[model samples]
Target chain A: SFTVDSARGIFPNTLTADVVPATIARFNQLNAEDQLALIWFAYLEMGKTITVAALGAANMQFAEITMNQIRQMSFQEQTQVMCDLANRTDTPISRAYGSWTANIKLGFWYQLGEWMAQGIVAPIPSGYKLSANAASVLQAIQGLESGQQITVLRNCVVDMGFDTEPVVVPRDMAQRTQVTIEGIDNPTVLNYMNNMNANDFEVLIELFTPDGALQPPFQKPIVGKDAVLRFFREECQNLKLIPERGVTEPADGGYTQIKVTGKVQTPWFGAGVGMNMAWRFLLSPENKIFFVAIDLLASPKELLNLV
Target chain B: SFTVDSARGIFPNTLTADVVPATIARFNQLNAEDQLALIWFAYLEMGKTITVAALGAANMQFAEITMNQIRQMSFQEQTQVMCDLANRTDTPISRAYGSWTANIKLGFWYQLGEWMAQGIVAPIPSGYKLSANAASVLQAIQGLESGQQITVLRNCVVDMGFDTEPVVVPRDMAQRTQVTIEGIDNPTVLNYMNNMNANDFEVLIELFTPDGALQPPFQKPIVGKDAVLRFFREECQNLKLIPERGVTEPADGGYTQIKVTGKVQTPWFGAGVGMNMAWRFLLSPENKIFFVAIDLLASPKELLNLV
Candidate 1:
């Protein structure tokens, strides 16, 4: 049995943040039937944002079987139960003093409570008017066992075209490329370049593969040890180059990549002009540089086309 | 000439959570050169999680040009700037009174700082040995205009094959189905079901489209007005059914999808057994139900073989 006065007794005149815990504690002390009635009242007040699952979880500690059974009950049976409980306690279903049986609107509220109980949320339909058959159907399920009740309710929902569980497809991963580098030290590579010059031309050639290529900006890839040695000898003299500022990391596929800034006293750029260069060193199994691509950082128009 | 003691002087020992804001504020008060040197010390203490972007954002307030320019500088120039500043302050690069130029590992730390400074993360290469050229490259960039320094550094990094910006492709949206309902009230829909029955079957038929369909378990869909009426007739006879429970939502497009629970008197299940059903109603432009698809909530075998 439920009473409006008892229901009203639990709520404060004005709710504040601090008293929320005490209010919840007070709510927990009520009987099961009274709790259900109060939950329906709360649902009416809060509308869609308030969920029946939350109410069930809080009250029943989410006992799956009981929750599922409760969900399976149709809106008619659910409302009838609430209405009966209200009647027994001398509390009518409507706070507005309207007769529960005549007003189809009460049935609407029951439907709201039932769907929310099942955890399906959607907007309600338009122009709906209550039919006479609602009470007879409610009466038919009066003394059914919980299991049969759930089965029938589930069938009803499915037959009415509600998607009980929507399928979610997992994301694909094969399309992504693996970008990474491995196994070489940056400073060691930097040391090898520290003292490079025409005098060390033969030594530099030994560091490369017999057929290693040097790809310079705006120039063809110079292959063979002889060609690489020749390029370095000419450039070393013309630029008066010294190997100094650099950052190095292992390139993808275990090669070394270096970005170097250097100082050169060249006629074109005058004394101590700065230059930026990049190198990709592909090392052989024998730890020799197998393929080396070198490029000037500036555009061809800026480096070679400048008058 | 960056000493660990000078770096250690920047951070407070016994760091409390509250003092972090104060510590960062004090750090910002130092000159930019000292800040860079101290950042390396913090990197050693904090590991890879320490980022130059965070330091720049917190201390320099994320100045875009300054951060970008700092990110562009080569490891050589960056460390040289730190080492030169350390020398001016009379602080040697190590704690054990070692010369900064003699230690190979400081070059490794500078490389680490430079990469992390650019917001790129990867393991350091192995077997790195520093050289005298490291200090020289750093020194050569001194007193140069910041713009030229930025230009060379940018080119150097670009030539190194690091992916400065990787392209990201968004996912396709074609595979998704938009199944939703909107623009109505749940209570009104429930009210309509309160009195629905065989007597109101014509009214029920009026709710659906002319070419309505009923889909039962393990059977092909029954379409057209005549077929829909026949199926309902048979269903009504087989089970002395009363409609009690229902939920309705505005369907995707101009349809309403409804799920209903009913009670039936049948021989196998005795009196007032319950069952569930679903319906999808496509409405005409006149707001009448245009197409309806109904389903039973069970396997064909379960519905037929439950003798």
Candidate 2:
């Protein structure tokens, strides 16, 4: 078996096996999730061995030990750690998924958080866990019912934050040049919007001011990833695919303004017919968006008047 | 008929006989909880009417319309508004309860904004708008199970920020206060954390901050009604028979400090049985809190050690 201690010695096969336990204990004393740095290292190594057999092999008695340890945390403790993990990410859908799916399955689909929150109403049935969905979906190995797999995967997506629509309209590729961030790539942001066909956009932003409340068209800048995905689904996906064929105008700073026009169909609006308006997409380095201000080509009612 | 004017002028009573549609629309546009407000108003005018039949018999159909408008709000809109409301409070528990409960019936109980960023899961069942648990509760009501009304009311309370614990905390007795707000008792930078009890907690606050961040707790306090409740829940709740008995402790000015020493059952570290703590709560006559600072008399671990 591979030992965690085989590395640079920050990790060890046992807590007693290393000098780092003092660091770990100190971490635990501060906050439980902080202590997870110790558990995370060991688990990272051991995770390679947590096969399905280790989790539920009927005859594998050791599987019980593995499952029990995984389930060792009280629900509150588990939730706290998971919430803390979520806090580390720009969004929690990915983080929450990372925590659960890490042990069970690869990221099959998004929406787990949404499913968990809404009780699988659209994306999930109430009260189903990711593992249960995994079990059902995996059972399709013998070819489970088509409806069964659809339901399972749907539940999975709901939990991850995809069952809904995007909250912010994705940055228009043609219009992105107009908006400028201190240090972000325009092309990368465009590429992401292109792939998702995002109409309602959601972004992670860092502000210099402590009291910076993200404004509308960008409210709840911080949300569960599942909520982000829901916003993506409700607002971004299936947008009327307006081609920014491209425009360039000068705006704040030395940024060139870009504009796009069109509407995307969305469940939130019942029917996705809205305006293809102008917006600014400011970016930070690595293409992370810092600002997405919509320059309304039409009023809210005007957009609603879309055919 | 009561006529209401909008930017467009008063309208003919084309809708209800006693109230015009414009009046209802104005209320709806301004408040999501206008249904509750309308119910309260209807009761004030025509006397208490809590049930559907009672409301209907009194021609308070406006309540139904307000309820429909609330129902019409997409879950996304509801969640956003709730988060906005939650952030307005100064109390930690109030914030947590507001944020977490936003997605309970409609949430995955996502606490952090990061969770929404990643994704959210449904708490309800497939092919259902509400959760199975909710449905079961409703069905039980139909089945003549007594106390269904209480359960429903309690659930509504929980949705609004009440926790699972008994709601007998001490802060329930306090009044809410905002900093920098004028018009009330000796409004100064000293009387924060005043007026707390089980009955006066969990209020939505909206401080038109010059910017988004909070002013220093010392300079300008934001301890409104929710903070009053949250302090009781987090510090003096359950451990004492009404912490901060509203005694007027002598202070430098004519102002009095609301002082108390009580047990605090911390969510993270369990209960600090008979833990001694003091808070100097100063208030403005306008009912806004201006200053507050907490002092724990003993090491929490000492209490733990004794236990």
Fnat, model 1, is: 0.00
lDDT (CA) per prediction: 0.33, 0.28
Clashes of 2: 125
Q: Give the range where candidate 2 chain A is weakest over 10 consecutive residues by summed lDDT.
A: A49-58
lDDT, candidate 1, B63-140, per-residue tens: 222222333355454445344343334333222212211111222233334434322212222343323443233333
Off by over 4 Å in 1: A1-188, A238-254, A261-272, A299-307, B1-307
lDDT of 2 at A35: 27
> For model 2, how does the per-residue alpha-carbon lDDT over B1-307 read when each residue is reduced to its tens digit?
1111110111111111111222222333333243233322222332211111111011112222222232225455434444433233344444544544221221112111111211121111123243334334334333321122222222333334323222222221121222221212342322222223121223312211121111221123333445544444333321222132223343343433343333322211112123233433443333333344433333323212211
Q: Model 2: runs farther than 4 Å from truth? A: A1-190, A194-258, A262-277, A280-293, A298-307, B1-137, B141-307
lDDT of 1 by residue, A1-307 (tens): 2122221221121111222232333333444344444444343443332111111001111122222233335445544544434343333322322221111222233333433432221212223322324323323323233222222222222122111110111111221122112222443344235324212455557777686766653345777889887666544322234334444445444544443433333322222234333344555445566665444433212222111
Per-candidate clashes, comma-separated: 27, 125
DockQ of each: 0.01, 0.01
